[PDB]
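Dear Dr. K.,

Following up on our conversation at the group meeting, I've run the structure prediction for alpha-mannosidase II from Drosophila melanogaster. I'm pasting the input sequence below exactly as I used it, so you can double-check it against your construct before we proceed with anything downstream. Let me know if the numbering doesn't match what you have in your notebook.
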Amino acid sequence: CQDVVQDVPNVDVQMLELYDRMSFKDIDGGVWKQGWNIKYDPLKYNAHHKLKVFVVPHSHNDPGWIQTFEEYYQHDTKHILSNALRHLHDNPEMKFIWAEISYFARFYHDLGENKKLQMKSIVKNGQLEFVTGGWVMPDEANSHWRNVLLQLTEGQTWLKQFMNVTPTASWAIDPFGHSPTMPYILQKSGFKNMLIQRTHYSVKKELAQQRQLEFLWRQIWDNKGDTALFTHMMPFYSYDIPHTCGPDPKVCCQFDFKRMGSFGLSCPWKVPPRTISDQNVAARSDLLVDQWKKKAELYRTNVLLIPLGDDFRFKQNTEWDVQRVNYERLFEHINSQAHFNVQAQFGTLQEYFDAVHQAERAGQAEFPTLSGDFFTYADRSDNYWSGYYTSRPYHKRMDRVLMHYVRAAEMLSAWHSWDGMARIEERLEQARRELSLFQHHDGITGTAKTHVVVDYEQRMQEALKACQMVMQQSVYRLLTKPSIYSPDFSFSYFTLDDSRWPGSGVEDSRTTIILGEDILPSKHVVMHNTLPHWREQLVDFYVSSPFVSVTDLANNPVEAQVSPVWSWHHDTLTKTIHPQGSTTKYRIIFKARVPPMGLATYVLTISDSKPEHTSYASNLLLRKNPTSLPLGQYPEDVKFGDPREISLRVGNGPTLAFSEQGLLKSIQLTQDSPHVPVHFKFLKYGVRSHGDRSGAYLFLPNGPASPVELGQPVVLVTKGKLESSVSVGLPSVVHQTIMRGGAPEIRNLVDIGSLDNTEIVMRLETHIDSGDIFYTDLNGLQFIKRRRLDKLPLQANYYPIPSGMFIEDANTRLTLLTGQPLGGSSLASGELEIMQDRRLASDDERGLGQGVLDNKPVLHIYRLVLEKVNNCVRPSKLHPAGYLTSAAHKASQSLLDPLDKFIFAENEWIGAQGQFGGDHPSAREDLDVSVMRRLTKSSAKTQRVGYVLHRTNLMQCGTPEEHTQKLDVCHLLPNVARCERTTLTFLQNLEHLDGMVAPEVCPMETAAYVSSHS
Ligand SMILES: O[C@@H]1[C@H](O)[C@H](O)[C@H](NCc2ccccc2)[C@@H]1O
Ligand SMILES: *[C@@H]1O[C@H](CO)[C@@H](O)[C@H](O)[C@H]1NC(C)=O
Ligand SMILES: [Zn+2]
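The predicted structure tokens came back this morning:
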């Protein structure tokens, strides 16, 4: 295995180093506004060396943005595809590329057989070519890598099944900045090439000057280069026709033949296109070939890519004709005029890349190696697109909840083969497709219109219900004696209980377990652990009595804690935010221990008085002017006091100190150690009163944030043997610090209310001497080093925080893990900050046509891990990556993939069993089974199950922590007959494995395996 820590890769372009050197001046470069006046030597191309030009027609079809997926399909996309089928069939030299398989599958299944056959024929002959082949063109900032892979696999599995093709070239013209997670996944999914577009205008200028727009993009820790993927970055401001023929949009706009008037489009540079004729074709060709030769100067081969398209183009038959006939006249002239030394034709993306690599093999060019990312994007001036790292945070959090529920549903149901009447495949396909659709670059990014966001939410809610159904049928089958198991596939044997989604104060969605001497003495509950190691985690349930005790299924008592159910209320009468306790529902909390990828059953039993193994939390309400807080049968009366600083310690864990406003002020790791200053603070950013306004995409603050004025907030302290917490009602945020014995969990119930033009940020202030360095993750896959640059504006120093961020010095590190993607930064040494929500009254001029005024309460979750790192083996100062410690990685897993909780729904569970998976191997902590999916329906003689195995890389800090089992996923199901390593989409077999054993993977690697069973 390659060492991902100690060897700094040698690359030609390392983006962090490039950023440190670049000046980012925004000067007027002439017609290429952000470039320079390109010059070329007319003698470069000649009879023996012609410029080969591929004009690639395309149509960017957003699966929701200003209209919903279905509205665009009915109004635009079905017409584009129907006319592409007709026009390509009738014009054999015409070509077209298609990216979004969600729309293609929606169209194809509505086609009659004759047209399906015609469609297959234009794909098979190369006229219609799929690029990427994912369900969508995903956001690359907020998306988790697991969901980028899910949506890629959904689209490519559909293409293999129905079109018999698997794209090896990727097209990503619209995500708002780009992540190396893409080439990581694509290269392990059979790809050979990829194309990107939205990168900072200063980066395009710098790379263009060095002809480094095509490069071998490798991961930041890859010393050898085996992860490298050839990448083409487009050079100009946009992917539309005006910014794709060459450097001068005035000129290129004249070659967009949809802009002469009858289509309602025009050229803003004020010169319209003119129909090509024999009287003007030589002058029009002179102008166009000059643009092409200028664009060609920015690249190293004699093969030039000219995209020809825009949003929802190629819709009308007349548009197909106007673009095709005019370009055919230009090609016929140009290709026959030897003096141009050009051969131009319609082409596809793969045709472009194949010709570039033929040139490279002929020795005509060598390409530079590059590592790093392309965040944060700015398309012009100081307009940095860091707002969408936070926009519509409720749905950003929902993405991570559904991510986990899809994984758990696919894994729980993979253990068995199911009759078609159980509708398991149907519900999992719906869930995978709705989650995949949301990965679109206007879905999770929060950049769609309000009614489109509602559509995505409704689709994800349906997907969650589908996952719950599959999960609860699976648990019933896995834990019921086989000869007693009697399923009704439409029945709810268990309901899921989720404590953090939508969350307390967001929705009253949780069911209370109703127990009573005159109704039901006890209730079974079951926990599922999707991770491949034994895991303990505290779990809680709402119960109708405080006198409840827990037992495992061998009837062994389990220590438990009962706490009240507290809800916070903005009291419009007293004008205070304060908690109210329930007098009939209580929370019972206990430690569940669950096998790797397994299930564990417990029983909750009511008693007439305090049970021997159940303790009760104390509660202290700190506020001036308190009033009583009755809790029914709860055995401990609530205590009151004036606001004051307080300290808490659960177990042998850290001791946390809090200010009189209920916010953390210090963390003491052990009895002897120092109280390390770690202060939480809430602040607000505003919007500019003149100039450009923040909106869904852009963050354009009116200066550094100002502290939220807190008043004298009400603080609630709950102290228990298993769990304690400090909660405070701040303006727009009920902030909660929860302690269970290890790093605390932070929960924020964020309700920005009617605060227009406000962004609420949560900041951590420490004295850690981090300087200008911090680390943020990319798609939940890797941590990349960031350097704050005071030569760039505040918003340029914000980066995506898809799952975590940290700062460190020689001795100390503070890591904040998140349960949802948000934007964040470190704006000064010792600080971390992460945006909670943003409400904006103005549109930011990117086409959305609205601000963001549809905020709703959201419960954000985090873990805060303060650690000593002076003993850790860390990368050298010049390495671009960072790595988590074991405790921070486990904390992230606790947020993203917690235990699932099931409540048996009827009175008696006949045939109940206590555990499933006790014999599953407990794999080393850095290894995960990211995906377990049965790939065959029950009628297949040979069953196939696919696994995606990911190993992260954790710092070695001196903990022996060893003795684990080898996990061979191919032997998890019985009767294995073959084991194969495959691409990550499971679509191509790469290696037939000896002894049917699937080897574990190296740190930072991801592999896929499929086991076949008779
Ligand atoms: O994803 C949606 C938005 O967020 C924007 O990116 C739109 N494209 C706008 C556009 C049109 C022509 C060229 C470049 C961008 C649309 O595709
Ligand atoms: C699918 O594509 C391959 C490669 O072109 C071809 O040989 C095969 O016949 C096609 N259809 C089948 C039989 O899967
Ligand atoms: Zn788009």
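Two things stood out to me. The CA atoms of residues 568 and 579 lie 4 Å apart. The domain at 920-1014 is CATH 2.60.40.1360 (Immunoglobulin-like).

Best regards,
J.T.
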